[PDB]
Design an enzyme around this catalytic site. Structure first.
Site, PDB file in Angstrom:
ATOM      1  N   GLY A 189       7.770   2.166  -0.201  1.00 17.43           N
ATOM      2  CA  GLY A 189       7.808   3.060  -1.348  1.00 17.43           C
ATOM      3  C   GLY A 189       6.646   4.019  -1.498  1.00 17.43           C
ATOM      4  O   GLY A 189       5.772   4.090  -0.639  1.00 17.43           O
TER       5      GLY A 189
ATOM      6  N   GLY B  94       5.332   7.971  -3.762  1.00 19.62           N
ATOM      7  CA  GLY B  94       5.781   9.305  -4.120  1.00 19.62           C
ATOM      8  C   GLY B  94       6.808   9.276  -5.237  1.00 19.62           C
ATOM      9  O   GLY B  94       7.736  10.086  -5.258  1.00 19.62           O
TER      10      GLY B  94
ATOM     11  N   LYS C 218       8.947   6.923  -5.766  1.00 21.55           N
ATOM     12  CA  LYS C 218      10.184   6.305  -5.306  1.00 21.55           C
ATOM     13  C   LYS C 218      10.030   4.827  -4.968  1.00 21.55           C
ATOM     14  O   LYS C 218       8.920   4.331  -4.744  1.00 21.55           O
ATOM     15  CB  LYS C 218      10.733   7.045  -4.084  1.00 21.55           C
ATOM     16  CG  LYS C 218      11.050   8.515  -4.324  1.00 21.55           C
ATOM     17  CD  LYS C 218      11.954   9.077  -3.230  1.00 21.55           C
ATOM     18  CE  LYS C 218      13.402   8.600  -3.398  1.00 21.55           C
ATOM     19  NZ  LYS C 218      14.273   9.073  -2.281  1.00 21.55           N
ATOM     20  N   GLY C 219      11.162   4.128  -4.947  1.00 18.96           N
ATOM     21  CA  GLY C 219      11.168   2.716  -4.622  1.00 18.96           C
ATOM     22  C   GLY C 219      10.460   1.839  -5.631  1.00 18.96           C
ATOM     23  O   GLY C 219      10.159   0.679  -5.346  1.00 18.96           O
TER      24      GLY C 219
ATOM     25  N   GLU D 253      -9.299  -0.309  -4.443  1.00 15.89           N
ATOM     26  CA  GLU D 253      -9.014  -0.222  -5.876  1.00 15.89           C
ATOM     27  C   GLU D 253      -8.918  -1.597  -6.518  1.00 15.89           C
ATOM     28  O   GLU D 253      -8.267  -2.485  -5.994  1.00 15.89           O
ATOM     29  CB  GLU D 253      -7.709   0.538  -6.118  1.00 15.89           C
ATOM     30  CG  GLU D 253      -7.712   2.005  -5.684  1.00 15.89           C
ATOM     31  CD  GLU D 253      -6.372   2.693  -5.969  1.00 15.89           C
ATOM     32  OE1 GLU D 253      -5.712   2.315  -6.972  1.00 15.89           O
ATOM     33  OE2 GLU D 253      -5.985   3.612  -5.201  1.00 15.89           O
TER      34      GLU D 253
ATOM     35  N   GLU E  53      -5.469  -2.465  -3.858  1.00 19.04           N
ATOM     36  CA  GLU E  53      -5.205  -1.864  -2.555  1.00 19.04           C
ATOM     37  C   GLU E  53      -6.452  -1.300  -1.907  1.00 19.04           C
ATOM     38  O   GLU E  53      -7.520  -1.223  -2.514  1.00 19.04           O
ATOM     39  CB  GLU E  53      -4.170  -0.741  -2.661  1.00 19.04           C
ATOM     40  CG  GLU E  53      -4.463   0.291  -3.744  1.00 19.04           C
ATOM     41  CD  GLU E  53      -3.836   1.657  -3.458  1.00 19.04           C
ATOM     42  OE1 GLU E  53      -3.646   2.442  -4.420  1.00 19.04           O
ATOM     43  OE2 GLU E  53      -3.550   1.955  -2.270  1.00 19.04           O
TER      44      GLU E  53
ATOM     45  N   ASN F  47      -7.383   2.092   0.163  1.00 19.31           N
ATOM     46  CA  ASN F  47      -6.976   3.403   0.673  1.00 19.31           C
ATOM     47  C   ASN F  47      -7.711   3.636   1.978  1.00 19.31           C
ATOM     48  O   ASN F  47      -8.935   3.755   2.007  1.00 19.31           O
ATOM     49  CB  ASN F  47      -7.315   4.491  -0.335  1.00 19.31           C
ATOM     50  CG  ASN F  47      -6.139   4.850  -1.192  1.00 19.31           C
ATOM     51  OD1 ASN F  47      -5.187   5.475  -0.710  1.00 19.31           O
ATOM     52  ND2 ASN F  47      -6.173   4.444  -2.464  1.00 19.31           N
TER      53      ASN F  47
ATOM     54  N   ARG G 164      -8.318   6.061   3.570  1.00 22.77           N
ATOM     55  CA  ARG G 164      -8.719   7.455   3.701  1.00 22.77           C
ATOM     56  C   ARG G 164      -9.747   7.886   2.667  1.00 22.77           C
ATOM     57  O   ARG G 164     -10.104   7.140   1.753  1.00 22.77           O
ATOM     58  CB  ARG G 164      -7.498   8.384   3.594  1.00 22.77           C
ATOM     59  CG  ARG G 164      -6.829   8.365   2.230  1.00 22.77           C
ATOM     60  CD  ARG G 164      -5.787   9.471   2.073  1.00 22.77           C
ATOM     61  NE  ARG G 164      -5.028   9.324   0.830  1.00 22.77           N
ATOM     62  CZ  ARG G 164      -5.574   9.258  -0.383  1.00 22.77           C
ATOM     63  NH1 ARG G 164      -6.888   9.336  -0.537  1.00 22.77           N
ATOM     64  NH2 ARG G 164      -4.804   9.080  -1.448  1.00 22.77           N
TER      65      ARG G 164
END
Length: 494
Positions: free
Chosen positions: A214, A216, A218-219, A323, A336, A338, A340
């Protein structure tokens, strides 16, 4: 007076203990990322080579950005035109990026954030053709997997997590990065409404039904009862078919904290304080703070530690964010990691004196953490010394310089406009065209806020901002924000 500058990137790599010369970099992106990447690295270039173009840049330009004359194009040393349209045809096209990286050729790629920046196949294909990546390696991202795997890895490492379909699942943990067996990974998903409702009653409503694949918008789905659970679960399937699905307890309005991670290719990883991004408007980080003071320095340091343990364990390299979810009481939960650099990274740069993209580039050339001037100065050591540094138990534990407030802003040729303010001298921003950010520094939080307010007010004059930046001022001035209360409920009735 001694000379600290070197001839070429080649001499730098040699004298700083690196093991790879990067002097041609390809920027797989555009907009503020493309520009920020270049501004930061060129700043570092001029300090180390008295030459701003010591490290060359090649950028990809779609017909759109090209006609709109994006600032990043004339800024780049070279640019290659690519197909227009959705990013899968250009910026987000891994096969294209690796292709261009080879033909030029460049010694490395930078993707920053957005597009193909979180796709492990990018660093994989780049490595497969001898092209370095300014970010974590594919093995490290793979080793981290989605939120499911990562959370198992989090719990394996004894870092708290919110109640979820995978609560309790751990992996048996000298080298070798952690891995999560496909059979332990499935124990965290739900294959049908049956085991879904199962986990549901064990986690308690309200909760979130999310597809690993998922994102964006969505999901994902919020279910508040067992009655609606089925339809909502099947809705997640219809949206992101095939995707593993998991459940997770809905966070009861708490603070969102991030820890800024930075790691070389030698097992060394440090925290660069964190950021406080609790203030949000419809899944959007509106106002951010550096460093995070809402939580006890003692509790936050621990969160740094768990973040570094998590990073070292998946063999992370470069910069990344962990996070967390800090609650009013004193409990926190991993959310989570990230893999990046983020858009609001300047916050950290400003309070730690670390040029992050420059850091990334040096790390990609193989320079070890203790040989990066910025990090040495942060640790109270000599600018160009060579002596090792004990990060675990430092002789001069780093302290963040001042405070920073950052606000996301909205409008009423060019894709990125550089914002300057005659009002406040400790504030700078930009505007991509839609949205942008303003970064305000201060001796203390109080001054950091005042500056931002004046800057924002200086913004309201511009026609495109005679409205959109009005609530940000009202928000920043509300006594609640001023005292930096723990509760963030006041945003609703603003």
């Amino acid at each position: 007076h001694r000379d600290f500058t070197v001839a070429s990137p080649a001499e730098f790599v040699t004298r700083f203990g690196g093991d790879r010369v990067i002097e041609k970099v390809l920027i797989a992106n555009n907009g503020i990322a493309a520009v920020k990447c270049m501004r930061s690295i060129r700043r570092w270039a001029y300090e180390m080579f008295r030459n701003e173009r010591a490290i060359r840049f090649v950028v990809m330009v779609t017909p759109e950005d090209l006609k709109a004359n994006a600032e990043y194009i004339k800024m780049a040393d070279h640019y290659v035109p690519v197909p227009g349209g959705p990013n899968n045809n250009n910026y987000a096209n891994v096969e294209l990026i690796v292709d261009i990286a080879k033909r030029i050729p460049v010694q490395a790629v930078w993707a920053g954030w957005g597009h193909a920046s979180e796709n492990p196949k990018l660093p994989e294909l780049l490595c497969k053709n001898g092209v370095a990546f300014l970010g974590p390696p594919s093995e490290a991202m793979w080793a981290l997997g989605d939120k499911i795997a990562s959370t198992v890895v989090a719990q394996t490492l004894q870092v708290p997590t919110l109640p979820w379909s995978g609560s309790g699942l751990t992996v048996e943990w000298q080298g070798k990065r952690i891995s999560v067996p496909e059979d332990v990974y499935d124990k965290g998903c739900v294959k049908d409404v049956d085991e879904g409702l199962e986990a549901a009653e064990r986690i308690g409503f309200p909760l979130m039904i999310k597809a690993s694949e998922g994102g964006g918008g969505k999901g994902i789905r919020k279910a508040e009862s067992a009655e609606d659970f089925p339809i909502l679960f099947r809705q997640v399937q219809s949206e992101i078919p095939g995707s593993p699905i998991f459940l997770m307890k809905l966070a009861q309005h708490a603070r969102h904290l991030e820890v800024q991670i930075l790691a070389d290719q030698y097992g060394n990883a440090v925290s660069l304080f964190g950021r406080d991004c609790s203030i949000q408007r419809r899944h959007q980080k509106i106002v951010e703070e550096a460093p995070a003071t809402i939580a006890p320095l003692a509790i936050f340091e621990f969160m740094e530690q768990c973040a570094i343990r998590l990073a070292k364990t998946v063999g992370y390299v470069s910069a990344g964010t962990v996070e967390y979810l800090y609650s009013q009481d004193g409990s926190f939960h991993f959310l989570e990691l990230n893999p990046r650099l983020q858009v609001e990274h300047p916050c950290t740069e400003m309070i730690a004196d670390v040029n992050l993209p420059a850091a990334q580039l040096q790390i990609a050339m193989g320079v070890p953490l203790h040989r990066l001037k910025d990090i040495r100065l942060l640790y109270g050591e000599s600018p160009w010394g060579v002596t090792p540094i004990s990060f675990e138990t430092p002789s001069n534990p780093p302290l963040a310089r001042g405070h920073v407030i950052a606000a996301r802003i909205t409008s009423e040729s060019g894709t990125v406009q550089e914002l300057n303010f005659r009002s406040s001298k400790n504030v700078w921003g930009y505007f991509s065209v839609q949205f942008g950010h303003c970064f305000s520094w201060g001796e203390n939080r109080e001054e950091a806020i005042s500056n931002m307010v004046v800057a924002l007010k200086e913004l309201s004059i511009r026609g495109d901002f005679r409205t959109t930046v009005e609530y940000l001022i009202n928000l920043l001035e509300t006594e609640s924000f001023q005292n930096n209360d723990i509760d963030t409920g006041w945003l609703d009735y603003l």
